[PDB]
Subunit: 209 residues, 4 copies
């Protein structure tokens, strides 16, 4: 790699062919639609939860990804380490507007399930979600005693699903919901970053914070 | 304005909520559609024609916009000064793909009409448009003996209209055609630059050249 | 604010007049220079420590900035909450290259001092800093029993000082050290973001992670 | 190439390590310096002259670069086709400020020399350069009866040289002048675009128009 690589104005101005949207544009698209169920992935969608995953990796598996299969890690992660997770502004704006519409708010996560969890409380508190609009976090996956994310979206009739990962968008696509992408922050520890827009889906501008 | 204004990473990463598209995405959206009529604005859409407008302003009205109402200017502009106009790559790609589809290609301009014009020839030659797909330039406007751009789009059943100006997009919208925006080059002499995306329309990436 | 604000190619290509540098360019500028003392601010320079500050604000002063004057907060912050702080890649690269040069590495922070601190250990461990190159964190400020950041830079003959805040750069300028700016992440809770480049200083590219 | 390539926020925020400067910063760097000689390359530095080169290629060598060795082309190019060349705003600002300083303004070009030329007049007129600050265009090169660009910079004691091409910057470097880069417009017909910043030189922001 050159010490002085330089640049040019074609590169400076270059845009990826992404369907960017704003929160205001999403709300406009819903004007006059009755209350409905909507859903949010948690990690890197509404919470920057890398601090707990970082601590977990360092504590339980410094030299691998084994911590993510370790029940001792998940018990810590789901019962208080989200006190260190930083709520995303894009999520504050989306949740506020869905609450204003009278929509039902679901959170659906791929985190491993635990005996108890305080994540639902962390979310309702941080985002000021009235109990009437709030629903306990859904721990979705392919383990016995679980339903997949796509199945939960169908079951709860979720019409819009927000998320940062490819599998969030394809879950929405599989059930005919509108999948809307949020950008994963570049300081997330979950790498590589996804290619937001990879399915031709809407991607929310400036949604990394 | 500060000598050293600085910047920050929210600004560096900030995106306008624009529906960007590529030529390949447009072509995909048309896959399996039968031949149809499509249309292109000329100036700053398919030709960088500022060289002739610049020369015209300097020659006929250095201190005003009067040259644009001067028949002597339009006679020069429409009968050879497009030899100095630079065809846009985005237009080469779009016209090639529409020709491949067997589509009919129309050009519709707000330039003032003249006794003769060699612009139609310049376009067919520069863009390698077979005579079978080519149509003489339509000089549209609100003068007596003219029809407006919107009327021509209806009359010719033009289904897609490409252009750089707000009035290109709103003409398409008025007749229910798909208006697709091309970016005006920042070295155009026609200023201010339009706000591409101002109607929520598709905007072609990297279309300034 | 317009629903569809649009954009134009002058805006898309616009650059702030910033002296950007890479880590490789900094290292080249130092080639053949003997070992020297260099220094780093901690928060948003080498650690994304917003998780602990976020938890602190929520715990000790949800409705104000009083937590930052609260000794109970600082005891938690400096004695373990950096387990949740995320080391920045730019800092890994800079520290690795300074260690390679045989340079002495100092960390100078405006955090309030506490009875004990485990931040120095967190830094040496996370960044793999050999004990020979490592120095205990300097808690600088204007309280009695403290020296200011500028005084410490003089005292330790620190030749390069990295940091994200205006006061990091002006501290370096005051003592004739080379102040180099790192970008604060847009998901930091410490807002507004600084104007990196505001003193005409070098700013490291892509340094938000 | 994927239909929907997507993007991510590391890419969106990524910056090349370029030393960007503004016109105001350049002027500040010269404050209190006595009048001096400065120089400008012409093509894609002060004039967007692609219209004439485009017409020339089409007229004299549609299927090659031979037009550039054709004296009939150069006679047209240098004796009136710059009426269609579009002056760059960055050049207006630089020339205005150098004229304000009382500096001597030279233009040095690699265009082939002709019996007569009207380019010097076009430049003085377009840029409002007082006769006292203006100098006839220097046609530099390696043909017999010529001196190279570097030799002219030495001969005229030119202290700052502005240009868009690598050879403009390296000419300045060879004689110890300050070479400052202007961005070539992406709709120039002279491709590929140069890597502005490739020598670690200053590059003027927004200088493509
Ligand atoms: Au996620
Ligand atoms: Au137009
Ligand atoms: Au800091
Ligand atoms: Au040039």
């Amino acid at each position: 790699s050159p010490l002085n690589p330089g640049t040019n104005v074609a590169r400076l101005a270059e845009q990826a062919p992404i369907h960017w949207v704003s929160v205001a544009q999403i709300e406009n698209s819903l004007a006059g639609r009755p209350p409905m169920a909507v859903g949010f992935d948690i990690d890197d969608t509404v919470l920057f939860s890398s601090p707990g995953f970082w601590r977990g990796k360092k504590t339980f598996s410094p030299e691998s990804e084994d911590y993510l299969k370790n029940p001792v890690f998940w018990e810590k992660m789901n019962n208080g380490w989200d006190e260190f997770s930083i709520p995303k502004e894009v999520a504050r704006q989306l949740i506020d507007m869905h609450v204003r519409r009278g929509d039902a708010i679901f959170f659906v996560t791929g985190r491993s399930p635990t005996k108890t969890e305080t994540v639902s409380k962390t979310l309702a508190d941080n985002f000021h979600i009235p109990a009437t609009n709030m629903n306990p976090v859904i721990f979705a996956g392919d383990k016995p005693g679980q339903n997949t994310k796509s199945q939960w979206l169908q079951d709860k009739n979720i019409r819009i699903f927000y998320g940062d990962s490819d599998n969030d968008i394809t879950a929405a696509r599989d059930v005919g919901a509108r999948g809307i992408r949020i950008l994963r922050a570049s300081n997330s520890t979950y790498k590589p970053l996804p290619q937001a827009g990879a399915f031709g889906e809407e991607v929310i501008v400036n949604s990394e914070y």
